[PDB]
TrEMBL record, chains A, B, C, D, E, F, G, H:
<feature type="binding site">
    <location>
        <position position="64"/>
    </location>
    <ligand>
        <name>Mn(2+) 3</name>
    </ligand>
</feature>
<feature type="binding site">
    <location>
        <position position="103"/>
    </location>
    <ligand>
        <name>Mg(2+) 4</name>
    </ligand>
</feature>
<feature type="binding site">
    <location>
        <position position="104"/>
    </location>
    <ligand>
        <name>Mn(2+) 1</name>
    </ligand>
</feature>
<feature type="binding site">
    <location>
        <position position="64"/>
    </location>
    <ligand>
        <name>Mg(2+) 3</name>
    </ligand>
</feature>
<feature type="binding site">
    <location>
        <position position="103"/>
    </location>
    <ligand>
        <name>Mg(2+) 2</name>
    </ligand>
</feature>
<feature type="binding site">
    <location>
        <position position="64"/>
    </location>
    <ligand>
        <name>Mg(2+) 4</name>
    </ligand>
</feature>
<feature type="binding site">
    <location>
        <position position="103"/>
    </location>
    <ligand>
        <name>Mn(2+) 1</name>
    </ligand>
</feature>
<feature type="binding site">
    <location>
        <position position="58"/>
    </location>
    <ligand>
        <name>Mn(2+) 2</name>
    </ligand>
</feature>
<feature type="binding site">
    <location>
        <position position="104"/>
    </location>
    <ligand>
        <name>Mg(2+) 2</name>
    </ligand>
</feature>
<feature type="binding site">
    <location>
        <position position="92"/>
    </location>
    <ligand>
        <name>Mn(2+) 4</name>
    </ligand>
</feature>
<protein>
    <submittedName>
        <fullName>Polymerase acidic protein</fullName>
    </submittedName>
</protein>
<feature type="binding site">
    <location>
        <position position="92"/>
    </location>
    <ligand>
        <name>Mg(2+) 2</name>
    </ligand>
</feature>
<feature type="binding site">
    <location>
        <position position="92"/>
    </location>
    <ligand>
        <name>Mg(2+) 4</name>
    </ligand>
</feature>
<feature type="binding site">
    <location>
        <position position="92"/>
    </location>
    <ligand>
        <name>Mn(2+) 1</name>
    </ligand>
</feature>
<feature type="binding site">
    <location>
        <position position="103"/>
    </location>
    <ligand>
        <name>Mn(2+) 4</name>
    </ligand>
</feature>
<feature type="binding site">
    <location>
        <position position="92"/>
    </location>
    <ligand>
        <name>Mn(2+) 3</name>
    </ligand>
</feature>
Amino acid sequence: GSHMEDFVRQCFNPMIVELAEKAMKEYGEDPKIETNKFAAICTHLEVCFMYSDGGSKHRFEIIEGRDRIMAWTVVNSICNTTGVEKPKFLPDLYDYKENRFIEIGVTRREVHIYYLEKANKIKSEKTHIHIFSFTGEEMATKADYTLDEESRARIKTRLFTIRQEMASRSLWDSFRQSE
Amino acid sequence: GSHMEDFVRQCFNPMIVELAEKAMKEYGEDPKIETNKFAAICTHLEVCFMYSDGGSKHRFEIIEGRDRIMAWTVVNSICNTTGVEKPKFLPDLYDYKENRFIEIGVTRREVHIYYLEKANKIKSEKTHIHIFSFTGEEMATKADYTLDEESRARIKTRLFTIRQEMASRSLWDSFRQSE
Amino acid sequence: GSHMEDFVRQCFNPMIVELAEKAMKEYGEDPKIETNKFAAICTHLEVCFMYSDGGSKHRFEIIEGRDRIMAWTVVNSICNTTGVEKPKFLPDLYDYKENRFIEIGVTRREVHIYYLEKANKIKSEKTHIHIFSFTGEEMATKADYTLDEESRARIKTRLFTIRQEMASRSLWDSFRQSE
Amino acid sequence: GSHMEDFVRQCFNPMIVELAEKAMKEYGEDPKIETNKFAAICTHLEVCFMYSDGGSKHRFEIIEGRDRIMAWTVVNSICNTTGVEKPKFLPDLYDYKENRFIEIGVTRREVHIYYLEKANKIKSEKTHIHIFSFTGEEMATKADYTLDEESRARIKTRLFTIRQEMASRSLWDSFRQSE
Amino acid sequence: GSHMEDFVRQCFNPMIVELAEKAMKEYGEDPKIETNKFAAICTHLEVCFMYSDGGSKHRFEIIEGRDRIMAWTVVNSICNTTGVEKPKFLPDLYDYKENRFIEIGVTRREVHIYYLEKANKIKSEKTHIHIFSFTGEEMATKADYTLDEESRARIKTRLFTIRQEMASRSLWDSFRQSE
Amino acid sequence: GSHMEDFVRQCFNPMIVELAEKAMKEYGEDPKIETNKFAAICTHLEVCFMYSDGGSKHRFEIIEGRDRIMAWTVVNSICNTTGVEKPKFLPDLYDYKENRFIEIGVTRREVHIYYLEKANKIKSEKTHIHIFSFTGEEMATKADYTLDEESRARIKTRLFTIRQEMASRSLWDSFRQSE
Amino acid sequence: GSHMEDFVRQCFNPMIVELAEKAMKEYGEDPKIETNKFAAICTHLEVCFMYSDGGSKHRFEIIEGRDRIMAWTVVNSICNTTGVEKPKFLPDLYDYKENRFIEIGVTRREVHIYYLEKANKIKSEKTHIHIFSFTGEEMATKADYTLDEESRARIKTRLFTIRQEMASRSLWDSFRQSE
Amino acid sequence: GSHMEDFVRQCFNPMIVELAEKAMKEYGEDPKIETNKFAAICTHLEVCFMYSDGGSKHRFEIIEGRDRIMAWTVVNSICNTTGVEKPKFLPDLYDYKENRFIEIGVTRREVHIYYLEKANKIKSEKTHIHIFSFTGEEMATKADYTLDEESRARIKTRLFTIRQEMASRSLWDSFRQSE
Ligand SMILES: COc1cc(CCNC(=O)c2[nH]c(-c3ccccc3C(F)(F)F)nc(=O)c2O)ccn1
Ligand SMILES: COc1cc(CCNC(=O)c2[nH]c(-c3ccccc3C(F)(F)F)nc(=O)c2O)ccn1
Ligand SMILES: COc1cc(CCNC(=O)c2[nH]c(-c3ccccc3C(F)(F)F)nc(=O)c2O)ccn1
Ligand SMILES: COc1cc(CCNC(=O)c2[nH]c(-c3ccccc3C(F)(F)F)nc(=O)c2O)ccn1
Ligand SMILES: COc1cc(CCNC(=O)c2[nH]c(-c3ccccc3C(F)(F)F)nc(=O)c2O)ccn1
Ligand SMILES: COc1cc(CCNC(=O)c2[nH]c(-c3ccccc3C(F)(F)F)nc(=O)c2O)ccn1
Ligand SMILES: COc1cc(CCNC(=O)c2[nH]c(-c3ccccc3C(F)(F)F)nc(=O)c2O)ccn1
Ligand SMILES: [Mn+2]
Ligand SMILES: [Mn+2]
Ligand SMILES: [Mn+2]
Ligand SMILES: [Mn+2]
Ligand SMILES: [Mn+2]
Ligand SMILES: [Mn+2]
Ligand SMILES: [Mn+2]
Ligand SMILES: [Mn+2]
Ligand SMILES: [Mn+2]
Ligand SMILES: [Mn+2]
Ligand SMILES: [Mn+2]
Ligand SMILES: [Mn+2]
Ligand SMILES: [Mn+2]
Ligand SMILES: [Mn+2]
Ligand SMILES: [Mn+2]
């Protein structure tokens, strides 16, 4: 095994790791080789899980963490009961309170570049966009950050905790220069 | 076993299935033969469970999911402590906040026909009526939908998810044309 | 064993029964003989448990359900940190929100007689008094019922459910004419 | 073993004891000899745990209960995402709602002496200070007690319960005259 | 509810009760009315469970405790892999060590009458027969009791414990004169 | 609380302690006062539990650890299915393999004095007698020690471990000179 | 989803299904399309699990159910501590008692054809071969069936139970004519 | 953290890791620095755990995995009930069947050098000695290996699995050249 893989298994809880292994394998990647992609999907999975935990009881429908067909089924059921436009690509969450899907991005570049690139890929204007980064900076559409400051600051802290742990194990540099 | 039965056991959590088996057998039906009635009572059971989960901590007394005699006991205790009129037929919930019983219907026809038919069977005007359907449409008495928009839209989504899963297994058509 | 005892073990959850057995034995009574006292302390224990569950997260300190010495220790710690007067007899709860102890009574007589008798035994005016009965009637000091209408009506319903179950087993009559 | 140690193991839940054993051993002390320091760190650990439980869902980041390096990592991540000043010594909590770290002290002297001594050791003015004592008295910076009266009064009661239990076992006197 | 029913729920573990409720309802009986049949199937279910527990690790295939169709499926699979004759009626166990099915009877008459009646109903000579009674007497085909003396004497004791508990609750007499 | 009581709660697992509290209270004693009797019944309870664990799967019926009436019920069922003589006093176990009841004694005197005294109290010759002591010495009827040397030596070790723990807490001397 | 897939999820316990999903995806297959291969690997996984359960406590090292690299690691450790020849292909078990690896095959053809084909693929003579089929027939190298008759007959029964369940759902025919 | 530490946490189950952390800290070492000593005590802990699992039900008293004082207490109780000589240093197990203590060594040198060195340190001839190594070789006193070949070969395999995992992570070389 790799050094990064062992770090992934000791920093992220097992359920998040199992979902990341299932997600990458459903797209042909192997967690034991593309190990920094392994850490990325784990990090992205934890961020969305904390994000939907930031609301009430059932404000959010979690799209991420399901296989492509079941995730599109919930997308279909959401679209064809609320009336919203079906997105071109799979989002990560659906905000019932705000009646909009959310795409959540976790980047190691500037929140400006990453938002611009995914806002380009999305093109469909309806779905909300919300980016975090491993430095503590965040950016959202219309500056509408959906959650309150306390929930989002928990996410920024967890991200900086991961970058710190990667650096003390000498794996942050390759993780940075691999996105 | 039937194909529908296997779908029922893999789509609804085991506790809901056990309650549905107990409910149908207490009325002489067998889940392994009347399999689309098996899916209906499971669907109806999940909807009411989500419905009472939509309130505070103890807003709702769940009438559905108990055997006829224990369910009438709670109905008696509710009626003879609050003062409300004892219903002619067994409701599904009791709203303490609103001081009224609720009958919850899940239909594959128009919410208008199904409401009209059960409002006819109820006749007793006190108990509230609330219908959902597998298309995302809902209808309630006095347009009083009891729950907020977020909780009810979760129920509509789950219903459309079930219809989608039934269709990909070729069982939605017989399920539709069997109510 | 007795018929009432078997009913007590099948109607009240095991933790409440274990506490009732411990409470009665600490005062020389045996649950297997004084069986209707066994049902009374179980009923009284469940009512107080639902009562403190009716508040926020930690509004209530539960006095009932502890042995005499540990219960007086919490009473001491409560009195000697808030400043309230130490009661002559052991209460059942302590309301931090209202800064007062509560004595909870469950009776099979008129709420008026039972309140009057315990208000006589208490004499110390500080601690709040709140009575329920197996008919759905309640009475509290200064008409201050502490909890909201939804929480108290849950307690009245549970009480009428117990009386109904006792009656169908022919044990309500002796339970009534034994208090 | 010591008498105090046995009391520590029977009064504090095992998870708090395990954390206290880990905390003291990471600083060269042995719980089986410095047994009243063993009770102190257990008491301090429970107080902070109740303290962060006094907020919403994720108002507080718990600093206490982690080893020195992981605790400083969260401190780093907190500081370098919110922007606050990194404290000279390890605090116990971080209040996101109030955007400030908290140092929690549990003393057997006057809240005035203990606050003054730690306010002297801290010197860095940013982090909040909050002291409790085994008599029910508390003191906080700017008289800003962070939590509501109900949560803090739970902590004062638990403290007086511990002192009472220590006294009936003859160990309060040495515990007092050892801080 | 009945007095016997409450005794059934407090003497037999819940899994055995659930199986008995499922078994009787699959044959049109209601546990709440035919309550002594309810105790009989519970007693019969526990005896067979102890019986198969009396062997090695996987000496016995349990036929009892499954619904009619799944029980016949295992009967089919057993018959059509070992080669034994398929029985006319559903047995309770299958002994691999001895290569024979077992029918287990629990009676309140003489082991001689009960064996004779079921040996008459079976007619198919292959399947083994083994009877216990609430007095401690047992009888098996060819005097081949399958299990050792220690396992069978546990079953006789449990049976006499049940009869004793029924008698102190005044329900043994009707239970006896109802088979 | 007492020092011995705290030692009892930290040395014996909670289930054994709960049984000891129930056993002593059923005979009018209070664990918080007669604390060395509290340790004795706990020690006696653990020894019998290890003893019956020393056999096969179901060699032993545990008589100890039940209340007087349920323990006599099993005694009745054992006697009136095996045919053995019903003992004058309650034994602790029943050996099916050897077809005899066992009385287990744990003493702090010489195994000779303790055996002689209980062999005097028993008088009924049928039931087996087996004594252990906190020094590692054991004595059984006809020198028939029922279990193998490995199981009995585990019991002697556990006993000497308890005496050692009591001595380091200064409570062995009063425990010795109290039997 | 497919009808076979739903049957796979309701007939095999979830841990076996998760392993089968992981095993097939590690070789590029998707359980939701190659659904009868999905049932085959599940069936093969359960058979090997029952097989190693047929021995003592730790007679067998399970090779099947691990990913290719971890399975080869145990193969390496086994070979390079016992001294046996490292097999050309991955076996399913390692028998320590017999000091040989085992390849377990579950077929829907004649045990003769399936054994011959895999004995051809293995070529390395050391590793043992053991075939079962859905009719109850088995064949092993040197007629050495490793396990006793009771354990192997459990496996044959489970296999015939699966074929029966597949047939009543109309999926046995395609499952047969797909190997 | 270190790379080795992350490997230790992902290869050994958490209970073994917690014991190793407690064992090293009780002797002044820190698992996060002396990380290959961290892997050694974990490996040594797992080997002894498998070793005592290799016997009957209670053949072995586990000495390793307790703190120095509690481990010496069991040593005292063992010595002063069986009569064996108290060892100069703490052993790892006590074999009741063979009436002797066992010292278990796991080495990365030749089993001959390691045995000779510890046989020199022990000097007390009574206690048995048993060495394993990461190559699959073992050596015991009088060639008495206590366990059967199947149990010991499981231990040799697990050891070679650990060395393989260390090598693929580049940490075996420093682990070898550090003993
Ligand atoms: C699992 O791997 C995948 C998966 C897909 C399809 C489903 N994925 C999303 O819907 C998706 N994917 C990404 C992403 C994209 C490229 C590299 C890494 C990631 C990242 F962050 F996961 F780590 N970010 C999101 O935020 C996001 O919602 C495509 C490609 N790779
Ligand atoms: C379990 O089967 C039954 C049960 C009964 C008596 C108790 N039932 C209700 O009280 C009830 N029954 C129905 C319903 C009615 C006919 C077919 C299907 C259903 C449906 F939806 F369950 F699937 N809808 C409700 O909403 C509802 O509250 C009558 C008949 N069948
Ligand atoms: C357990 O039995 C006891 C206990 C005590 C001392 C502690 N008890 C209370 O503090 C107490 N006792 C009663 C009560 C009094 C008489 C009969 C029955 C009850 C009742 F309801 F429990 F069922 N009601 C309360 O509300 C109440 O707080 C005295 C006498 N009996
Ligand atoms: C575990 O033992 C230790 C630990 C440290 C470093 C980490 N500790 C804190 O950060 C800390 N330490 C104390 C404290 C100080 C001296 C004696 C006792 C305590 C007390 F209360 F724990 F019991 N109080 C706090 O409030 C507090 O946050 C220093 C010294 N001893
Ligand atoms: C559940 O109720 C039923 C079930 C059936 C069909 C399946 N049953 C058996 O296969 C069966 N049935 C009986 C039995 C027969 C009559 C009354 C009571 C019982 C008894 F003991 F359960 F309590 N004894 C056995 O030993 C036995 O194997 C027939 C009738 N009633
Ligand atoms: C719980 O307290 C009791 C209980 C009883 C009746 C039931 N007890 C037994 O059947 C019994 N009682 C004793 C024993 C006797 C006197 C003092 C202490 C014990 C001892 F060891 F428990 F600690 N030893 C046995 O071995 C034994 O089987 C009588 C008296 N006290
Ligand atoms: C935890 O660390 C320690 C502990 C002690 C005292 C208690 N220890 C034993 O009783 C002991 N110690 C060793 C050992 C010795 C030196 C280095 C590494 C180990 C090894 F293998 F743990 F990894 N081997 C055994 O087999 C053994 O029974 C001394 C020194 N270090
Ligand atoms: Mn996504
Ligand atoms: Mn995303
Ligand atoms: Mn209904
Ligand atoms: Mn309805
Ligand atoms: Mn009270
Ligand atoms: Mn009261
Ligand atoms: Mn601190
Ligand atoms: Mn502090
Ligand atoms: Mn049967
Ligand atoms: Mn039968
Ligand atoms: Mn006794
Ligand atoms: Mn005894
Ligand atoms: Mn194979
Ligand atoms: Mn050692
Ligand atoms: Mn060693």
